[PDB]
């Protein structure tokens, strides 16, 4: 179905979704619960980290022409909040500075002309999930591995739980993604910054991501590490990310 | 093989970390510890085992053989590993629980043969359980190099990882690719794109040959310990997924 | 051909002391061998799986060994509950009766599974006994039938893998009884024609563990109460 190349910037800011306990302590999860049995664990929803995703509207156009998106810029926003070791961090010892935030982290981004497409797998199939959120259906033993059945359109902000979802590599035929997981207690969060770096989007045949319904979708999660509280407790703390995706006008039949 | 004559294959292939029970499929029994080497007998559930599948391929019939030329491969269910609110034991007093974390194994192989394998054990007296295959008439040279100890891939939730390597004496017709991070407090690091293919063609630009129409996929994904709320710790595994490009080539 | 476990007939302890419990076969050594506990009038309880790892809720007193031509239980710090009947039992994959129970040592100081359809019927009579499972996933289990006649040890009679694919019979049974499940209604069904005198007992629906392709394991790890059936 795809012609011959017949441009355009759009730029976003994508906030993070890490629970939100209250106003002010946004970009943050609630405290994290620990040893629930497999069979009674039902976490709060404000526990719990989501895919942020949204959907920016492209000129509408019009042997029909689409948005090819070419290339994107991406970063996190806000490295440098974590040299803040003055409020609310426990000491790192007697007389010391705050505990920098460190461990589990998970940095993942996303362009597609559809909804990114993901695939259910659970540290618990038993995990009684909260209301608001969208998880696995009907789960089983076998979504603790690979269960083909949890299928889903990353079609919700602040819905689908990070712990319960990843990119479909089995589909996706229209999005480009990314992501990295780092998990341990004492993992440093290593984060660059710079605007002369590109990442193409054009596949093997040369072919960006079609934007269907002049519809451009970015999906993104920056789960940073936990943050210590004087208490002893932690929280997830994430960071928003930016895009800039470079269009192309490309022909296509029918 | 003469000169070269499309299809794609997919493949969800899931772990074998020793499933104690349903409920704990993808983990292992916990890990027993101090045993003498002159008195071992480990259970089956708490051995990984190495995953393997043949996937048939379309009958081609001078004749063509099918040639795997890419592959496209990730761990599945590496946000998994952000539940620390259930089963693990708290980092501390009012903390969230003990991420995943330990020593770890990544390998897949793509093949046109079952993968070869050779035997190394860490004590060649270790009494393996019944329903596995582990190197036979183990001497003391089994803890370094035994080249009798030779094997197929050729049955899954049978073969050890901690007894079997890949060979690379053989598998002429297999690329294979694995990395063993070892330690008690070594971080899982996992990367997942869409955008990444594996080029499995050689020196001389042909890739592995699928013989009986049939196509190879094994995998090892161990992805560390989980220390439960006891003490206990159980290895947990997530399945990989395979895309693999195939072409007709005569020969 | 059949592979032979051999356990005295009985042993005697005092309470506090040790109970030792052989099982004799030819390079026992080179099998993995289970033990049982078995009080009369209940299901039997696996205490030992691959000569020596201890299932969750047996206590650290009761230990097992394997070399040679003796596999060994041993349970020390001997208290009243210890007192029941004891069987050692092996699995060879590749051999025409697979499963071998021990002859059995009497001793002297969630998921479920129901069977029912046992009674009493005219000797070259028919019975079907069934085996409703509850709180598992059915086609990922091999499952088997093991009787005990009157003042005789646990005779294990036939097996099924998950898939309903591996049909395993004692030479006994071969060619009267048929064994079937049926996985959507989580049903193992033992089909008794041409029935015998023999035949009397109480029959035991026994489960493998989970296995991803539902194989069989060599391993009884959960056990129904038991049916009888007079003939």
């Known amino acids: 179905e795809v012609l011959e190349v017949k441009i355009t910037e759009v730029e976003c800011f994508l906030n993070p979704e890490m629970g939100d306990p209250d106003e002010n302590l946004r970009g943050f999860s609630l405290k994290l619960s620990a040893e629930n049995d497999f069979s009674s664990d039902s976490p709060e929803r404000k526990m719990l980290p989501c895919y942020s995703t949204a959907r920016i509207p492209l000129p509408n156009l019009n042997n029909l022409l689409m948005w090819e998106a070419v290339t994107v810029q991406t970063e996190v926003i806000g490295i440098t909040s974590m040299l803040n070791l003055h409020a609310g961090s426990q000491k790192v010892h007697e007389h010391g500075g705050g505990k920098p935030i460190q461990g589990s982290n998970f940095h993942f981004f996303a362009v597609g002309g559809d909804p990114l497409e993901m695939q259910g797998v659970l540290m618990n199939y038993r995990t009684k999930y909260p209301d608001g959120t969208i998880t696995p259906k009907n789960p089983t033993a076998q979504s603790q591995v690979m269960n083909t059945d949890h299928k889903a359109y990353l079609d919700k902000n602040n819905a689908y739980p990070v712990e319960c979802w990843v990119p479909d590599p089995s589909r996706n035929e229209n999005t480009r993604y990314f992501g990295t997981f780092t998990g341990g207690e004492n993992v440093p969060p290593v984060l660059h910054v710079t605007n002369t770096a590109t990442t193409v989007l054009l596949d093997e045949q040369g072919v960006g991501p079609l934007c269907k319904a002049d519809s451009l979708y970015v999906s993104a999660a920056d789960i940073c590490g936990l943050f210590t509280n004087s208490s002893g407790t932690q929280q997830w703390r994430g960071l928003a990310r930016y895009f800039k995706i470079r269009l192309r006008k490309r022909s296509v039949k029918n | 093989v003469l000169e070269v004559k499309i299809t794609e294959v997919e493949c969800f292939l899931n772990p074998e970390m020793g499933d104690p029970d349903e409920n704990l499929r993808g983990f292992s029994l916990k890990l027993s510890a101090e045993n003498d080497f002159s008195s071992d007998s480990p259970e089956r559930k708490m051995l990984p085992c190495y995953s393997t599948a043949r996937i048939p391929l379309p009958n081609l019939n001078n004749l063509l053989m099918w040639e795997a030329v890419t592959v496209q491969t990730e761990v599945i269910g590496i946000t998994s590993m952000l539940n620390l609110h259930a089963g693990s034991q708290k980092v501390h007093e009012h903390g969230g629980g003990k991420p995943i974390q330990g020593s770890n194994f990544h390998f897949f192989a793509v093949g046109g043969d079952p993968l070869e394998m050779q035997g190394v054990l860490m004590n060649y007296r270790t009494k393996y359980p019944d329903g596995t295959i582990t190197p036979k008439n183990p001497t003391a040279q089994s803890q370094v190099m035994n080249t009798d100890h030779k094997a197929y891939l050729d049955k899954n939730n049978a073969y050890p990882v901690e007894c079997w390597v890949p060979d690379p004496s053989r598998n002429e017709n297999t690329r294979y690719f694995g990395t063993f991070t070892g330690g008690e407090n070594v971080p899982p690091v996992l990367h997942v794109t869409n955008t990444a293919t594996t080029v499995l063609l050689d020196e001389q630009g042909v890739g592995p040959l699928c013989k009986a129409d049939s196509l190879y996929v094994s995998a090892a994904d161990i992805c560390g310990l989980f220390t439960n709320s006891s003490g206990t710790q159980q290895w947990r595994g997530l399945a990989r997924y395979f895309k693999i490009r195939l072409r007709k080539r005569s020969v | 051909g059949s592979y032979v476990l051999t356990q005295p007939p009985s042993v005697s302890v005092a309470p506090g002391k040790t109970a030792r419990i052989t099982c004799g076969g030819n390079n026992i050594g080179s099998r993995s061998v289970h033990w049982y506990q078995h009080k009369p009038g209940q299901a039997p309880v696996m205490i030992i799986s691959?000569?020596?790892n201890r299932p969750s809720g047996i206590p650290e007193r009761v230990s097992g060994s394997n070399y040679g031509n003796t596999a060994t239980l041993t349970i020390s710090r001997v208290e009243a509950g210890d007192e029941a009947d004891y069987y050692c039992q092996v699995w060879d994959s590749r051999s025409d009766h697979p499963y071998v129970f021990g002859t059995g040592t009497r001793v002297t100081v969630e998921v479920q599974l129901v069977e029912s359809g046992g009674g009493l019927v005219k000797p070259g009579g028919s019975l079907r006994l069934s085996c409703a499972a509850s709180?598992?996933?059915?086609?990922?289990?091999?499952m088997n039938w093991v009787r005990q006649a009157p003042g005789k040890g646990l005779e294990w009679v036939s097996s099924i893998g998950g898939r309903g694919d591996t049909t395993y019979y004692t030479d006994s049974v071969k060619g009267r009884f048929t064994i079937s499940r049926d996985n959507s209604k989580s049903t193992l069904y033992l089909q008794m024609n041409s029935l015998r005198a023999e035949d009397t007992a109480v029959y035991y629906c026994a489960k493998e563990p989970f296995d991803s392709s539902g194989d069989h394991r060599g391993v009884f790890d959960y056990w129904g109460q038991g049916t009888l059936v007079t003939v």
């Open positions: 691959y000569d020596m």
């Open positions: 709180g598992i996933t059915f086609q990922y289990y091999a």
